[PDB]
RNA sequence: UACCUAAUCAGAAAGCCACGGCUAACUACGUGCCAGCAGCCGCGGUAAUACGUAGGUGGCAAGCGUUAUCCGGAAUUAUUGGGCGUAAAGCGCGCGUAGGCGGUUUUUUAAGUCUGAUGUGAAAGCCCACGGCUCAACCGUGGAGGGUCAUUGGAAACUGGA
């Protein structure tokens, strides 16, 4: 949806969490123009905007397309501060990042056709799938065994919580309740819980 | 800022001369042979650690002694170049009176060894201040003062001539017995002819 | 033991009788690694001896910044000079980023729940003076309870 | 003939902008107060990557620069948001009730602060949930439900007026 390089997400933002090594062959200093100079200090509203831009490259849906995402991480009752990390893992990228189909989120959004999609009935080729207690995000009859669906079947052993994945199946249908602290913590919570409100 | 540190009249009680010989008629001739033998030893020294010269040809004892810091391969593996130096000095005139050597205690006291570790990176137009801020502290550990980074123009890699004032320490010259090394040395590595205002002191 | 933040060492090209005198004004934040701001400027020839010079001559310009339950007690401002700041509360278990003004004010207050705010300009001489103006004008839980002189749960 | 995993022909996310910047952004030529650039800056009388072409870069999203219309900007007839002096502030008007307002003890018959008819308690109303249209308009819950519709008849030693 960004149609650009996916290597500037760990340079303009301060929370990428998409790859292990990225500053090994790059230059982990400051920005681009003044990359050989010193760094700065994120502003009050800037830190909440930097995280939004940091999640802008991470989340497939950008400004206006992620309406539900922001709407579910604000008005929704519960821990408003940690509502951006709780009610935001209901996408189709989580299933691919828990079964072993795509290591990135952008590739996980395009893995809703090449990889497992048939979630025990009606499927969805969007970046977010309605996986609830009863949906088994699996593959189709003709696309039972794919190349991107059965790529890292043995390379990705450790799986995440509230997710299921096996050999020649990769059907997620475990717990429906997820963790609100089972995600990277680099951005502020109350800051985004107030700024968004406005 | 022409601080040249008049050491000429400052020495003479501890620092005499490198060449010594009883003459007045053979003086110019002896001095002519001094530089004549210095045109072959300078190419054989290859910028060695030479503080002073022990050319004491007085009282019939002529000998062009060269310090050359610690005895390495300059004299040869077991004095193998000492026997080859005979013809070397025999080709010039007919001296070759067995030149001797001298063990220089505290080799890092001259401005040649300090310019071979901190001023050796200036040949490739590299560090000319960061490495020039070092060695003075090492010279202070030895017991002396050291050198003082200075320049009059062409500051490192730049087409615009710039000066400086990084004098880490002072230089005593109010006395008439003060001993100062002041070992000047420059190299023309495709950079052009230019003079520096570096200041040194024992 | 003490989180000293040496931002930069402002230099000066003195055009006096002398060729080019070099005066490095090493700038270092005099923080006590707790929640105080701290700011001191030196003027010695040796930055190391100049950084501690302002840390031993200016270490009482700090202000005690208490915390409620992991969130800024009050969103204060800063009206001292050009550069200004702002206190934005966040969750106790969070973090900070880079991009804006000074970073040695909320970083000293190990809480990871405050966002350092200071627009004004880039001049780091009138932007840190506004940060201490709001830090000293901060509103605490009991601090405001005494203002009314009743109960702590009667002024919220 | 929506989402659509299906036939699985090959039907194309480009773009325009700042680029020394302010403000996330550039290299060579060509210019050289000629022209360009041109909110803030300014850059043009020679070495303007600020100019115009090429290789570009930061942004964002099927596009991009423009014109008139609320609020971030910031309290700025100050209301939270004005002085009774340099600031934003000395009516020279010395003699007089604009009812705006300036101790009078005690003392009053109840100006009064918190109780009382409550049925009603509805609402393109923030409905505590409530239906789906993947990107769009698919609508029942009047008691809950606040957005009611018990706040004295009342307890006087008390703004200006004794």
Automatic annotation (TrEMBL), chain A:
UniProt xrefs under Pfam families: Ribosomal_S4 (PF00163), S4 (PF01479)
Q: Which residues form the Small ribosomal subunit protein uS4 N-terminal domain?
A: 1-89
A molecular function annotated in GO for this UniProt entry is:
structural constituent of ribosome
* One Gene Ontology CC term in the entry: small ribosomal subunit
- HAMAP family tied to this protein: Ribosomal_uS4_B
* Family per record: Belongs to the universal ribosomal protein uS4 family.
Briefly, what is this protein's role? With S5 and S12 plays an important role in translational accuracy.
Q: What is this protein called?
A: Small ribosomal subunit protein uS4
Q: Which organism is it from?
A: Staphylococcus aureus
Automatic annotation (TrEMBL), chain B:
Official protein name in the record: Small ribosomal subunit protein uS3
Instruction: Give the record's subunit note.
Output: Part of the 30S ribosomal subunit. Forms a tight complex with proteins S10 and S14.
Fetch the Gene3D superfamilies from UniProt.
3.30.300.20, Ribosomal protein S3, C-terminal domain (3.30.1140.32)
Which Pfam family would be a valid example here? Answer: Ribosomal_S3_C
NCBIfam families xrefs:
rpsC_bact
Report the GO molecular function annotations: mRNA binding; rRNA binding; structural constituent of ribosome
Q: What HAMAP family does the record point to?
A: Ribosomal_uS3_B
Which keywords describe this protein according to UniProt?
Ribonucleoprotein, Ribosomal protein, RNA-binding, rRNA-binding
Q: PANTHER family from the xrefs?
A: 30S/40S RIBOSOMAL PROTEIN S3, SMALL RIBOSOMAL SUBUNIT PROTEIN US3C
Q: Which gene encodes it?
A: rpsC
What cellular component terms from Gene Ontology apply here? cytosolic small ribosomal subunit
The record describes the protein's role as: Binds the lower part of the 30S subunit head. Binds mRNA in the 70S ribosome, positioning it for translation.
User: Superkingdom of the source?
Assistant: Bacteria
For this chain, the family text in UniProt reads:
Belongs to the universal ribosomal protein uS3 family.
Q: Where is the KH type-2 domain?
A: 37-105
| GO term, biological process aspect, one | translation
Name the SMART domains for this protein: KH
Automatic annotation (TrEMBL), chain C:
* Gene Ontology process terms (BP): ribosome biogenesis; translation
Which family is it part of? Belongs to the universal ribosomal protein uS5 family.
Supply the HAMAP family for this chain. Ribosomal_uS5_B
Role this protein plays: With S4 and S12 plays an important role in translational accuracy. Located at the back of the 30S subunit body where it stabilizes the conformation of the head with respect to the body.
Q: Enumerate the Gene3D superfamilies for this protein.
A: 3.30.160.20, 3.30.230.10
The record's listing under Pfam families reads:
Ribosomal_S5, Ribosomal_S5_C
Q: What is known of its domains?
A: The N-terminal domain interacts with the head of the 30S subunit; the C-terminal domain interacts with the body and contacts protein S4. The interaction surface between S4 and S5 is involved in control of translational fidelity.
| Signal peptide region | none
Domain (S5 DRBM) spans 2-65
GO CC term, one of those recorded: small ribosomal subunit
Q: How does it assemble?
A: Part of the 30S ribosomal subunit. Contacts proteins S4 and S8.
GO MF: rRNA binding; structural constituent of ribosome
Q: Which UniProt keywords apply?
A: Ribonucleoprotein, Ribosomal protein, RNA-binding, rRNA-binding
**Record's protein name:** Small ribosomal subunit protein uS5
Q: State the gene name recorded for this protein.
A: rpsE
């Amino acid at each position: 949806r960004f149609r650009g390089s996916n290597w500037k997400k760990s340079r303009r933002l301060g929370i990428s969490l998409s790859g292990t090594g990225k500053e090994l062959e790059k230059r982990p200093y400051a920005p681009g123009q003044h990359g050989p100079n010193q760094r700065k200090k994120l502003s009050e509203y800037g830190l909440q905007l930097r995280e939004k831009q940091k999640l802008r490259y991470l989340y497939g849906m950008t400004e206006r397309q992620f309406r539900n995402t922001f709407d579910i991480a604000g008005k929704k009752f519960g821990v408003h501060g940690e509502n951006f990390m709780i009610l935001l893992a209901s996408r189709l990228d989580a299933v691919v990042y828990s079964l072993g189909l795509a290591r990135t989120r952008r590739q996980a959004r395009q893995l809703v056709n090449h990889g497992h999609i048939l979630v025990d009935g009606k499927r969805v080729d969007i970046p977010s799938y309605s996986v609830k207690p009863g949906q088994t995000i699996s593959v189709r009859e003709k696309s039972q065994k794919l190349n991107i669906i059965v790529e890292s079947v043995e390379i990705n052993n450790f799986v995440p919580e509230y997710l299921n994945f096996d050999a020649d199946s990769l059907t997620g249908t475990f717990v429906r309740l997820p963790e609100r602290s089972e995600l990277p913590a680099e951005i502020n919570e109350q800051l985004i819980v107030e700024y968004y409100s406005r | 800022g022409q601080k040249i540190n008049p050491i000429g009249l400052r020495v003479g009680i501890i620092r005499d001369w490198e060449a010594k010989w009883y003459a007045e008629k053979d003086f110019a001739s002896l001095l002519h042979e001094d530089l004549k033998i210095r045109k072959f030893i300078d190419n054989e020294l290859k910028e060695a650690s030479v503080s002073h010269v022990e050319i004491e040809r007085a009282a019939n004892r002529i000998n062009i002694a060269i310090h050359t810091g610690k005895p390495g391969m300059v004299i040869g593996k077991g004095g193998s170049e000492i026997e080859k130096l005979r013809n070397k000095l025999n080709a010039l005139t007919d001296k070759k009176v067995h030149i001797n050597v001298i063990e220089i205690k505290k080799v890092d006291l001259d401005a040649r060894l300090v310019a071979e570790n901190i001023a050796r990176q200036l040949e490739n137009r590299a560090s000319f201040r960061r490495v020039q801020k070092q060695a003075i502290t090492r010279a202070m550990k030895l017991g002396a003062k050291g050198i003082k980074t200075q320049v009059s123009g062409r500051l490192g890699g730049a087409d615009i001539a710039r000066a400086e004032q990084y004098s880490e320490g002072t230089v005593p010259l109010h006395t008439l017995r003060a001993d100062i090394d002041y070992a000047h040395a420059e190299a023309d590595t495709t950079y052009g002819k230019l003079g520096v205002k570096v200041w040194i002191y024992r | 033991e003490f989180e000293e933040r040496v931002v930069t060492i402002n230099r000066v090209a003195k055009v006096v009788k002398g060729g080019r005198r070099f005066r490095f004004t090493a700038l270092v934040v005099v923080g006590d690694k707790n929640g105080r701001v701290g700011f001191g400027t030196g003027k010695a020839q040796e930055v190391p001896e100049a950084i501690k010079k302002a840390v031993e001559a200016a270490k009482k310009d700090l202000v005690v910044v208490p915390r409620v339950e992991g969130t800024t007690p009050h969103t204060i401002t800063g009206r001292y000079g050009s550069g200004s700041v702002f206190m934005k509360p966040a969750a106790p278990g969070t973090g900070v980023i880079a991009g804006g003004p000074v970073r040695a004010v909320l970083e000293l207050a190990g809480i990871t729940d405050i966002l350092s705010k200071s627009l004004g300009s880039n001049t780091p001489i009138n932007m840190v003076r506004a940060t201490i103006d709001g830090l000293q004008n901060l509103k605490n839980a009991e601090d405001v309870a005494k203002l009314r002189g009743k109960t702590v749960e009667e002024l919220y």
